[PDB]
Amino acid sequence: TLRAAVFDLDGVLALPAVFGVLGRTEEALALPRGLLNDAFQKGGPEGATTRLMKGEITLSQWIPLMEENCRKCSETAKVCLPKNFSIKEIFDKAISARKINRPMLQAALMLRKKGFTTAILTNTWLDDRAERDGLAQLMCELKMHFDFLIESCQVGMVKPEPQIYKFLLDTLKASPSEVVFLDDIGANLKPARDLGMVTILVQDTDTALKELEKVTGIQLLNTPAPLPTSCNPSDMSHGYVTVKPRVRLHFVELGSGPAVCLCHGFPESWYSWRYQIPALAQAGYRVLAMDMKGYGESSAPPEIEEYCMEVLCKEMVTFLDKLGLSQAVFIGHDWGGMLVWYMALFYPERVRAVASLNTPFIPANPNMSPLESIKANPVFDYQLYFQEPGVAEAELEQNLSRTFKSLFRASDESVLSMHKVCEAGGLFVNSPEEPSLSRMVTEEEIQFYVQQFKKSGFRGPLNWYRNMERNWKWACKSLGRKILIPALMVTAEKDFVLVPQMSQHMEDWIPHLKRGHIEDCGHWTQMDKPTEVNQILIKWLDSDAR
Amino acid sequence: TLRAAVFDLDGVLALPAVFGVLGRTEEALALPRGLLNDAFQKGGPEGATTRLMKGEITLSQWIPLMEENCRKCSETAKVCLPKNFSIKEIFDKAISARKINRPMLQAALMLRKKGFTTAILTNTWLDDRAERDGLAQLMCELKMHFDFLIESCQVGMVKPEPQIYKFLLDTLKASPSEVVFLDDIGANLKPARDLGMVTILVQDTDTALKELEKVTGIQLLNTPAPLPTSCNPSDMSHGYVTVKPRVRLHFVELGSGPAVCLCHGFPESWYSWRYQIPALAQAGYRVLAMDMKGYGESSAPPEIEEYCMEVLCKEMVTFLDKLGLSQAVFIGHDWGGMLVWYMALFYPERVRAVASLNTPFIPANPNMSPLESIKANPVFDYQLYFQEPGVAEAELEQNLSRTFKSLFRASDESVLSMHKVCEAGGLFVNSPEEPSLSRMVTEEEIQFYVQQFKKSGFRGPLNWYRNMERNWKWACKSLGRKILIPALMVTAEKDFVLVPQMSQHMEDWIPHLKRGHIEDCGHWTQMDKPTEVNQILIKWLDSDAR
Ligand SMILES: Cc1cc(-c2csc(N)n2)c(C)n1C[C@H]1CCCO1
Ligand SMILES: Cc1cc(-c2csc(N)n2)c(C)n1C[C@H]1CCCO1
Ligand SMILES: [Mg+2]
Ligand SMILES: [Mg+2]
């Protein structure tokens, strides 16, 4: 029966509520109880506050009107307001104090995931104060999680007037009995109740969630910890930069602050960062999540040498030049990880800080051909399989779904040993035609990769492995250097190819290296353990790159 | 004969030179003359400094080696270095002191404009110091003006070794006699001279330019003031954001820092900001230059109401939401100017600051239909001509070249009165078939507009004028408000439609409004007077939006 859920902002999705600051200020300053609330509410439907909430005036215009109300209320109550008493001050403080009430948001999200239409209906104001950016941030963060946001000041109507509830119903395209509405102000619930909406009076959050859960029949309290926000591709800003005549690079871009360029591994996509992109933007960064050369909407030229580390890095520099970015933080995974260590070594002036997931920095061995070095570790045998042009392409392109479904698996699910792949004759020779779906991914997410890979297939991707000799000679030039910019290495316990021990000597080349470590994490770090990756990146960004 | 020009960075394109800081520090600290230069040069081809310039070691690794050289030089000269003596300190200071030597850059630019290939050949280092971003900025700003940048540390070779000059010649694809090479170090010129290159020894800039001018036969000194840098479309980052199912918005994006969204007028393009985009990025801003809805690579739906101010503003808010931007500075011109005043009035929380070129803020008159208000000023008669769907489209689309060439004219060139356009039967009824080219634009620039307008023509653009009644009713809601965020109004003396007097009452609605005024400037402000626009925007941005 219930199809829709409506939440107020103050006192419901965000806490502490501003009205609360009226109460507290009175208490703190020993003013007559309720004096501030009388001033706030003076003139009722035609007083300053209603005009504010309806959009007739802006917040900065209302401030001196509330001031005047406070004077008149205090003269009528035969008291004086203290020296320094400041309405602007009180509200600046109150509005920055108010934070997202996380469990209410997570309930709204769960309800939306089970197919509810969700909305925020709020009495609010046009905010033109010097510090308005703080509220603009909160509203952005909240509203992306909901179907609709209805603000009194944008629509010219306020709770409890009946017309806003009619406007609500019409926006929802639902009848009143299909709607639950939560509010901390009982007067605001009444007209919803009159129409036959389920209403919940929100005092403490848990009891409201308990009622919300009873009435919807959905579990909202004590639920497992949810994944971070992911990205819908068609909701993103897509950027494109031509770095030379045949080569354009595509990226997705979210947030403001220091530029952070995310570089995925093989055979992946910008979308492999879907769980980090909103979190890093939310934490105060400008994220640029690349399709690396060879992939997705980036160009994919056929020639092997187009994909050696030197050419790749030079193009990433050009990509910064054309965007007008003197630096970025570079964060890489797998092949992207190797590339970011090379950026740090050859273009430290362009790199604000460098981090890798899984991929250690290993210096070239000038006394050993890289082919031999690769042949020395049985777990890299899949890289020899990748050498011969055409062979891996045919296997990987033959059935894309099966390809991504076989590759993208958590450590407790794996179907492919990386073991004696040449000898066996292929990566999939002993995996099913139709693999089961990993817990890490949905069917929809697999089909995003399949559709990406239909544009250019695996030639350009595989070519990143086909420049061992060329990369080795370029790397040998850097053998006297050290990496002395801020650097983070993140090892994954159960990546059985890029094993955490393989990073064990990095402090010789990177003496101030920082570390994080993720337990029970396979090769596909960002989607295996997105919460833990997010926390380790944001903590290191805030301390080292900011 | 000469086809190419090569410039050193230190002492040639940037000043004061670092070597100079060796001299000055000695003098300042009363050290033995030349002591620092001996330490710097110790071991010659195999000393620390050469290894640095060749890329073997990074700057931070070299710092303690130069320190040690300075100790050994001072022990051998029987003196002591002062307490606090700091090589890191000296170089931090020297490297931030060094600025682009503007007249040398402007000579290189002029030579490139007359078809020279230009290059920077420099002995430089891999810079990993905490403060490296300053040099990364200088190198970005310089290098975008040149065909090639050749850095000793990237190529593994240093002036004066002969191999780098061979590498130079090969990069230029020129024989030595086709090249002029400028350097402040005579030892560095010699191998160019040995090959038969024209060389110039740069002491003071003017005498070097004088020799450069004699030898090339091109005027480089005492030249008129050049235009600001413009944008090549195919060198820009292009961004695309879907703000709702039928509507995607395209923009060009350059720079980092506070987001600044540029909104062009009718019938224009992101490209109309070509002279502001590099300057504002260079001044420390993130520029987003839109194709407004109706234009260029943005969607262009046919329906009139898709283009009312309300829908337009809501979509600009969504564009911020999807990019993850809690605010931007909004700067508009003509129709874009009207739109930014509306953003300031309806979404002040999303607007960091607002500026308009030409377009004044005028409140709706609630006692007069907007059609009448328009009929009251003979100079708006072209807006009535625009009302009837199809009529203006046919005239404007009939011959695009003639359209843009007739419209885009400086005030001393105009071919169209805005006068009794309905009565005359068209905007062009009395202008030539093939207008002459305005001084403001090249043939190439006109053809960029023509090609943009072949995608959707003039329907969507004209529709911005066809919502007078709808805009009037929306505007009436804002009649109690004031604009109290930072605001700049820029009037143009000779815009005979949007006249500077029309802005004269703006202080009633915008009490802290700032102003700039541009004399001898017609309607097409950004390209008429790009230098003056740039200076007024950047000064106001730095003081009000930063
Ligand atoms: C960690 C690592 C070691 C080597 C290696 C060793 S010797 C040689 N030539 N290469 C390579 C190529 N990697 C990169 C990883 C990331 C994905 C590709 O393998
Ligand atoms: C300055 C201005 C006044 C009016 C106006 C007056 S009364 C009414 N309805 N409109 C308009 C539409 N403008 C906007 C300019 C910029 C380009 C379009 O004209
Ligand atoms: Mg409330
Ligand atoms: Mg020099």
Swiss-Prot record, chains A, B:
Induction (free text): By compounds that cause peroxisome proliferation such as clofibrate, tiadenol and fenofibrate.
Organism from which the protein derives: Homo sapiens
Chain's gene name: EPHX2
Binding positions for phosphate per the UniProt entry: 122-123
Reactions the enzyme catalyzes: an epoxide + H2O = an ethanediol; (9S,10S)-10-hydroxy-9-(phosphooxy)octadecanoate + H2O = (9S,10S)-9,10-dihydroxyoctadecanoate + phosphate; 12-phosphooxy-(9Z)-octadecenoate + H2O = 12-hydroxy-(9Z)-octadecenoate + phosphate; 12-phosphooxy-(9E)-octadecenoate + H2O = 12-hydroxy-(9E)-octadecenoate + phosphate
Coiled coil ranges: none
Active site (UniProt): 334, 465, 523
Name of protein: Bifunctional epoxide hydrolase 2
Family: Belongs to the AB hydrolase superfamily. Epoxide hydrolase family.
